[PDB]
Design a protein around this ligand. Structure first.
Ligand code: NAP
Ligand code: NAP
Ligand code: EST
Ligand code: EST
Lengths: 280, 281
């Protein structure tokens, strides 16, 4: 009990790890409502929770498909404390591919989950934190949300959108007690990439470039990808702040890339640097 | 004429003005297909085309509703010259109000017109450009796309999505001889805002208050700082002119001190406080 937390997308990767990290906190002060798109996939979560030995009642899972506003309401109605102190917007999908090759459904789907879904959670939940003048909104950051990456145009679009959405609300919410923070992450070892996935819809040059990008991402992800457990610690950090900043970074690694991006509004610099980073 | 320009959102504001500025060019080098979401509202385009006297055959309008891919294909197939030298993705929409007060179809249209709508345009026009090894794609920027503005949360999300889409595509296109640039705009006197909004029920009194506090400020800013749809149109020309154009063209320096401010603060709270003070004193 105390500190009701409600996290989205906890079947795996980040959701699952922060769920049980929070529920197994030595302080025992968190009540965790791990929500998932489909409960039948909750095996691992529970096994992890069970393996960690969490106070009974410290974990509860609800079904919440962030792309359905009815699902959202319902789960909210299932939070018995009638309050959420920490709201975690963590679900999201990637989408890779030459822009001309991406399909309408995939595009829409990405935007609906990553952006539109955070919008739904907040509408359903800001109100009562604002009214209670207390609440903490933590949103899962992503680096392809801070800078453009070749072949991930739509993913990046949907990921920059969260920044924008988040940045607008913090400008407002400051005064109401509610604090929003993004936990920005680089590659992380989750279920993410395995799910993320042309010849007939792209031209020979983009095609070969695609394949060249592809190969490299995978080698690099494997080299940089952090642990999903490393990332929960950052969410804990932020949520431990007395006055939390709007950005928390899970690694210093992209920092350098970011600064030369910001050091040049025309953007010509980043473009060249990123083209060479990706195609040598 | 020769440079074939294709512009979306030409029933008014920047679309309209860019469309007849180019068409009435002395050089007379451009052919302009000004597309309109609904051709029936093209009378003002024509009257203005007339007012600057675009020679016959310099301007052709078409229906293109960026929300519908069949509309896109059709427009594309009515480009007689079979090629587009400049693609101006301009149609866009605003949405203003407490997040919690915004309607699900409102939030969705804003993302589909603004974000998916440019994704549909490029998917259709880019390929041939890439084949040609030549083309210039200009996208109407927006400052709500570079930094966050209270009570404009979804408008800003859709606008930061055009930056990620265009920057992501720019890293790739670099070596293809295809040029994509964002014309970043601060406030402008177009129809944009008359439609942005006109709450009590859908939000608390505390938020309701801030809302009005914000409308006070924005109205003042538009009033004392907006630019003309034609001031803006000279930037797309500057941008289309440069032989080696950048990703961004700002139509004003105005929010550049505030842009840097943000730029030199990764953690993001300096900008949040400044913006906070700067709007709700
Ligand atoms: N992995 C990385 O390297 C990385 C880097 C930066 C940012 N991120 C971001 O971190 C979050 C992804 O976490 P992850 O890396 O752990 O990915 P993941 O392992 O694939 O886990 C994501 C979770 O999101 C869920 N989800 C998908 N659609 C949903 C929906 N409609 N409603 C509710 N839940 C849904 C998934 O459930 P199902 O499995 O049932 O579909 C899964 O539980 C997103 O914000 C992602 O963009 C990840
Ligand atoms: N006004 C500003 O202060 C400002 C500032 C920065 C950026 N911008 C941007 O520049 C663009 C132009 O807007 P504006 O300022 O010129 O105001 P505007 O006069 O309202 O321009 C909007 C035009 O685009 C059209 N459009 C809307 N939805 C469409 C759709 N689904 N399919 C095709 N066309 C559609 C509108 O059609 P209908 O007439 O039929 O509605 C209208 O012709 C937008 O991207 C806007 O975000 C404007
Ligand atoms: C797209 C991400 C950003 C930065 C990463 C990167 C950054 C630079 C680069 O040359 C390749 C990659 C591939 C994998 C990427 C990441 C996987 C998820 C993350 O958001
Ligand atoms: C972001 C825009 C330019 C900046 C404008 C601004 C900038 C500062 C501010 O305090 C209020 C407003 C009102 C609306 C904004 C605009 C709406 C559309 C445009 O993109």
């Amino acid at each position: 009990a105390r500190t009701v937390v409600l996290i989205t997308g906890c079947s795996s990767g980040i959701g699952l790890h922060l769920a049980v990290r929070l529920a197994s906190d030595p302080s025992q002060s968190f009540k965790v409502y791990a929500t998932l798109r489909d409960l039948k996939t909750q095996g691992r979560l529970w096994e992890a929770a069970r393996a960690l030995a969490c106070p009974p009642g410290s974990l509860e899972t609800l079904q919440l498909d962030v792309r359905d506003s009815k699902s959202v309401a319902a789960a909210r109605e299932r939070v018995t404390e009638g309050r959420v102190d920490v709201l975690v917007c963590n679900a999201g999908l990637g989408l890779l591919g030459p822009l001309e090759a991406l399909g309408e459904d995939a595009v829409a789907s990405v935007l609906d989950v990553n952006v539109v879904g955070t919008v739904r959670m907040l509408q359903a939940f800001l109100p009562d934190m604002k009214r209670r003048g207390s609440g903490r909104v933590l949103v899962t950051g992503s680096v392809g949300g801070l800078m453009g990456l070749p072949f991930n145009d739509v993913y990046c679009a949907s990921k920059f959108a969260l920044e924008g959405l988040c940045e607008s609300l913090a400008v407002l919410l400051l005064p109401f007690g509610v604090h929003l923070s993004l936990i920005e992450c680089g590659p992380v070892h989750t279920a993410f990439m395995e799910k993320v996935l042309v010849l007939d819809r792209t031209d020979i040059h983009t095609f070969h470039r695609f394949y060249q990008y592809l190969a490299l991402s995978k080698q690099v992800f494997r080299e940089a990808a952090q642990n999903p457990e490393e990332v929960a610690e950052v969410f804990l950090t932020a949520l431990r702040a007395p006055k939390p900043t709007l950005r928390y970074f899970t690694t210093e690694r992209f920092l350098p890339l970011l600064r030369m991006r910001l050091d040049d509004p025309s953007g010509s610099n980043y473009v060249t640097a990123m083209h060479r980073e990706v195609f040598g």
